Amino acid sequence: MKTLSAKPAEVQHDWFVVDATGKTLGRLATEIARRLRGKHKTSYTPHVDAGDYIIVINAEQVQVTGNKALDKKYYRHTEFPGGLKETNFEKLVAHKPEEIFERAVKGMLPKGPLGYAMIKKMKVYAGSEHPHAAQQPQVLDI
Amino acid sequence: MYAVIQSGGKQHRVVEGETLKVELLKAESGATITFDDVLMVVNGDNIQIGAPVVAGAKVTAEVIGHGRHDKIRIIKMRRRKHYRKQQGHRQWFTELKITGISG
Amino acid sequence: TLRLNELAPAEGAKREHRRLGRGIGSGVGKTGGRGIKGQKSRKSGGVR
Amino acid sequence: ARVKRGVVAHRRHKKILARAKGYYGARSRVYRVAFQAVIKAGQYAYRDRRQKKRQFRALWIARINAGARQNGLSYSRMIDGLKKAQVIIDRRVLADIAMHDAVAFAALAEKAKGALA
Amino acid sequence: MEVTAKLRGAAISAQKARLVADLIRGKSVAHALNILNFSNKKAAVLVKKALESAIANAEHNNSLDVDDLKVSTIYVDEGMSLKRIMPRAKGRADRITKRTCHITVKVGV
RNA sequence: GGGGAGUGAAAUAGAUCCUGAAACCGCAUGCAUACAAGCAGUGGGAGCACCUUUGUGGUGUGACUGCGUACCUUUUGUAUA
RNA sequence: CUAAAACUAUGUGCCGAAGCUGCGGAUGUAUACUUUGUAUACGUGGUAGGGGAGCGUUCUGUAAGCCGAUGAAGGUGUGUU
Ligand SMILES: [Mg+2]
Ligand SMILES: [Mg+2]
Ligand SMILES: [Mg+2]
Ligand SMILES: [Mg+2]
Ligand SMILES: [Mg+2]
Ligand SMILES: [Mg+2]
Ligand SMILES: [Mg+2]
Ligand SMILES: [Mg+2]
Ligand SMILES: [Mg+2]
Ligand SMILES: [Mg+2]
Ligand SMILES: [Mg+2]
Ligand SMILES: [Mg+2]
Ligand SMILES: [Mg+2]
Ligand SMILES: [Mg+2]
Ligand SMILES: [Mg+2]
Ligand SMILES: [Mg+2]
Ligand SMILES: [Mg+2]
Ligand SMILES: [Mg+2]
Ligand SMILES: [Mg+2]
């Protein structure tokens, strides 16, 4: 006997939709990343993407505690001699809620081709509606 | 039929007709050995779990032969310290084949 | 038992000469038992 | 007794270069580079013989965790409960049963739960 | 069956001739002859000589038909160099290698 | 310069001519490779191609993944720029 | 990351090293009986350095022997110890 690896051809990703209204950001991100990597499956293999698809709706209703809505800063550098750019959480959430989940979840995943391939299975939408009605998502109560 | 047995300090999950290698044994090639310290037996929604042993369970097996694994090369080196050392290794094993599982 | 083919010396009577500077595994390799960088490590190194 | 270093030297270089097949560039062509490449490969293999046993136990523990959390426990409590019920199945076999036989693993989880209560 | 022709000792380097050999590899014999006829490269003349020789060998010694032939194989190898001296400034001297090649053509149906 | 013919036991013994290694440079076949960051391996490990048996075999390649800053010398101490 | 994923106090589990235990193998020293064979026990990271035991190479005797055109040395692959 020996320990077998999961075959990518036998892997079956499933589809789930999670509602983000009134939820702490990081305590949701950890669950999303754990589902994206496949740690909840007994066929988990660290070199195979045996994860699941997640749909986030109402991405502009996610919450932070304390004073972070005004005090949490997001940074960027354009690679020009003085191109450091700064924004807020609350300016960025009313203007681009997809990037907040992008950053929060991608920071919690591996950093390489398989990590780039896992983040593709997260689909974030600001409103209540998504376009993937043909995939038949389940309501995951995270 | 999926029993669980102990041998050579390790544990194995076996079925009937399976051929497996374990650590070297003292038994003779062509003899028959019996494991009577069995840990679990599963016969299909019928599951006997030992605490730590299933009482009247037997697993019989036959000794096909003894052999060596392929050569491993050990290399020790210390950079800038004028020290190198090399060694070879082949590990011994006994090959069994499972004949019967009682339950 | 008496041939030029079949004559051996007594046990412990011959030894192999010591050879310096012939690799790591001999124990007498790189510097050959002399140490590092002194007057006694030079050629003709002993003092009177 | 003049001794020529032609055959033995050539055979040693040849044996070192036969152990470097598949390496990139001068690492499979040039003796000076291939010799360091073979030594470093041996060092890596010595260290990874030790690391393999850690990686495989980590994988077993992760699969057992995934299996136990479907049955209502965490890994810690299932391992504690099985040790309190005198079950001595090791992790290599528990992970196998988790990955291939869900019914027997539910039986093991129920035994552990019963031991805890 | 392939019919061979060799041109050993061409007074050009193999790197320059490989460019022309890449242009006709695997083509029909007439098309390759056209390409070589209307080239401004110097290696084209030597390669056309070797190809003409291979076609003549295929039709004379082997008695084959020419409109069915192809340039199935062609490759260029290096020959032996000529070593020369070039005086440089301030009394220094450089070494010049004059390079050579071997062209090999194989024509087949 | 070669291809036939012919000599010879032998012509990749053809005159740069016994044997004919390595560095270096081609042509052919198989697999991999154009969203991904580092001493180029090592521990795993899917797929494909060719052999073979009715394989828990053999050969080549290696997607993805954990770990991992050459060797010698001299130094209190070197991935050391 | 905010009734924490911070801090203080207490408790129950678990993870975690080449440490320790299990199984298989080699080796140093000393002892016990055969009287040279195995057990027992303690040990087995190493620079400078000291001690011990070996492999392979050319040449002389053994050798007017033994192997070789039914193919030696050398070169190039494969398998195995
Ligand atoms: Mg020493
Ligand atoms: Mg010195
Ligand atoms: Mg000094
Ligand atoms: Mg001194
Ligand atoms: Mg002048
Ligand atoms: Mg020949
Ligand atoms: Mg020759
Ligand atoms: Mg790609
Ligand atoms: Mg780069
Ligand atoms: Mg200095
Ligand atoms: Mg200094
Ligand atoms: Mg360092
Ligand atoms: Mg540098
Ligand atoms: Mg523990
Ligand atoms: Mg350990
Ligand atoms: Mg130890
Ligand atoms: Mg032991
Ligand atoms: Mg020691
Ligand atoms: Mg020790």
Side-chain angles (χ1 to χ4, degrees):
Chain A
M1 57 173 293
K2 35 164 44 184
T3 314
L4 268 31
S5 265
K7 311 282 200 63
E10 307 180 354
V11 171
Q12 178 174 279
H13 318 281
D14 300 302
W15 285 81
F16 301 93
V17 47
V18 51
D19 187 274
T21 308
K23 282 196 170 171
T24 292
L25 169 69
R27 310 203 166 250
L28 180 72
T30 57
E31 287 333 285
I32 295 172
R34 163 170 191 271
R35 301 299 192 123
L36 290 187
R37 199 178 193 208
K39 292 290 270 290
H40 63 304
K41 302 191 188 176
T42 55
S43 53
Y44 162 74
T45 287
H47 67 96
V48 171
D49 193 15
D52 282 341
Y53 284 85
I54 322 283
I55 293 162
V56 188
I57 57 148
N58 291 111
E60 33 74 53
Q61 311 293 344
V62 89
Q63 301 284 297
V64 277
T65 55
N67 260 275
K68 278 182 260 162
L70 190 120
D71 272 39
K72 193 194 171 72
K73 306 288 157 54
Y74 294 90
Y75 296 98
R76 234 170 38 204
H77 209 284
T78 70
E79 282 105 36
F80 283 74
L84 183 85
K85 288 182 163 71
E86 209 182 7
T87 198
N88 240 359
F89 166 89
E90 78 196 342
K91 282 186 211 132
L92 186 56
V93 80
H95 150 53
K96 215 171 164 176
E98 41 268 11
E99 192 193 327
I100 284 174
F101 279 81
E102 179 249 314
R103 293 176 80 136
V105 167
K106 160 206 60 65
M108 285 173 204
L109 284 167
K111 278 107 189 131
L114 190 66
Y116 312 145
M118 292 177 202
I119 202 69
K120 282 189 62 154
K121 297 177 311 194
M122 197 191 41
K123 266 95 179 162
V124 186
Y125 298 97
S128 195
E129 292 325 87
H130 58 80
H132 318 275
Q135 272 57 66
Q136 302 185 39
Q138 303 296 105
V139 177
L140 182 42
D141 218 58
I142 271 183
Chain B
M1 194 176 123
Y2 164 13
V4 171
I5 69 162
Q6 283 180 313
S7 195
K10 294 169 265 292
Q11 299 173 10
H12 315 278
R13 188 176 73 80
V14 299
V15 294
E16 271 196 3
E18 195 173 347
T19 41
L20 76 153
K21 285 162 187 56
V22 301
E23 295 285 340
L24 193 63
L25 281 175
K26 300 288 207 59
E28 165 143 64
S29 168
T32 332
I33 58 203
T34 163
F35 311 86
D36 35 353
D37 39 340
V38 174
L39 316 179
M40 180 178 19
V41 169
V42 168
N43 192 56
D45 67 60
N46 157 250
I47 305 143
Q48 315 211 270
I49 319 197
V53 157
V54 190
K58 297 320 189 134
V59 157
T60 85
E62 210 186 12
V63 173
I64 304 164
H66 312 273
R68 298 191 97 183
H69 294 282
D70 284 355
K71 177 81 88 49
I72 292 175
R73 185 185 336 253
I74 301 108
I75 304 199
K76 280 152 165 151
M77 216 281 287
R78 196 85 68 187
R79 67 161 158 202
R80 297 178 313 256
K81 296 312 164 163
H82 196 229
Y83 167 84
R84 197 161 64 221
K85 218 197 249 202
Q86 288 183 31
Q87 197 202 303
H89 187 79
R90 299 186 78 198
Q91 177 87 341
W92 281 93
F93 66 76
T94 306
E95 189 162 14
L96 316 184
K97 175 185 189 54
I98 303 304
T99 331
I101 296 174
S102 289
Chain C
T1 201
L2 187 62
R3 313 274 165 175
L4 292 173
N5 217 25
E6 304 167 358
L7 275 169
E11 224 56 78
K14 305 294 181 82
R15 300 194 39 86
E16 88 201 10
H17 202 90
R18 172 210 306 265
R19 274 160 86 229
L20 314 173
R22 288 311 178 277
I24 285 188
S26 52
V28 274
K30 156 201 206 173
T31 46
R34 288 197 181 239
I36 317 168
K37 240 183 186 184
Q39 179 176 20
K40 311 173 61 160
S41 91
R42 306 302 162 185
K43 93 199 169 33
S44 74
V47 300
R48 167 168 55 81
Chain D
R2 186 172 177 252
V3 173
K4 293 184 75 186
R5 318 142 40 192
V7 181
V8 185
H10 174 53
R11 186 198 331 150
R12 298 190 103 211
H13 279 196
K14 200 185 169 37
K15 272 187 267 216
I16 279 293
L17 279 151
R19 291 152 66 178
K21 312 212 151 117
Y23 297 178
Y24 172 76
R27 282 166 180 261
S28 44
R29 290 170 230 236
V30 173
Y31 173 81
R32 274 178 209 255
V33 183
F35 184 71
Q36 291 163 199
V38 163
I39 291 304
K40 186 46 146 293
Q43 286 169 247
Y44 279 148
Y46 180 94
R47 176 214 65 181
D48 293 342
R49 251 175 259 121
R50 273 119 205 93
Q51 287 180 350
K52 181 182 186 192
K53 307 165 168 73
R54 313 173 198 181
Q55 301 195 36
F56 265 103
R57 181 152 160 144
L59 180 52
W60 305 327
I61 288 180
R63 276 175 191 179
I64 293 155
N65 221 332
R69 273 166 156 99
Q70 288 153 13
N71 276 281
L73 311 146
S74 43
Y75 164 90
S76 290
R77 291 191 162 129
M78 202 197 160
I79 287 283
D80 182 36
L82 280 185
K83 280 209 171 27
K84 285 180 197 211
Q86 319 262 110
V87 178
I88 68 178
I89 310 269
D90 72 11
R91 287 147 184 92
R92 189 171 84 102
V93 180
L94 284 174
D96 209 60
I97 296 164
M99 207 209 184
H100 300 291
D101 208 349
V103 202
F105 199 91
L108 277 153
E110 209 53 65
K111 195 131 221 291
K113 279 165 169 189
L116 292 172
Chain E
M1 150 185 36
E2 263 148 37
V3 182
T4 331
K6 290 178 168 150
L7 212 186
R8 282 180 55 91
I12 188 169
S13 46
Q15 208 208 316
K16 282 153 189 178
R18 274 161 193 166
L19 293 173
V20 175
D22 270 335
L23 242 183
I24 68 149
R25 176 173 293 125
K27 284 170 159 59
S28 101
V29 148
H31 186 197
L33 281 177
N34 265 353
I35 289 169
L36 293 161
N37 267 311
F38 287 98
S39 209
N40 61 336
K41 295 294 225 163
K42 162 203 177 182
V45 194
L46 304 162
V47 174
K48 173 196 201 287
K49 211 162 287 269
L51 187 77
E52 276 179 272
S53 214
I55 297 149
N57 298 341
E59 73 196 2
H60 186 256
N61 312 333
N62 295 252
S63 319
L64 269 52
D65 43 317
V66 184
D67 58 349
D68 269 46
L69 287 178
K70 208 151 310 289
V71 184
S72 41
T73 326
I74 175 145
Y75 47 74
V76 188
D77 282 323
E78 293 155 5
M80 62 160 314
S81 305
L82 291 173
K83 305 301 190 280
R84 310 291 187 231
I85 287 296
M86 183 163 236
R88 280 299 192 131
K90 297 190 176 176
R92 193 187 85 160
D94 285 6
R95 297 185 58 174
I96 300 297
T97 91
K98 301 183 65 109
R99 288 182 185 272
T100 279
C101 68
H102 308 316
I103 306 163
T104 303
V105 194
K106 268 160 198 154
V107 146
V109 275

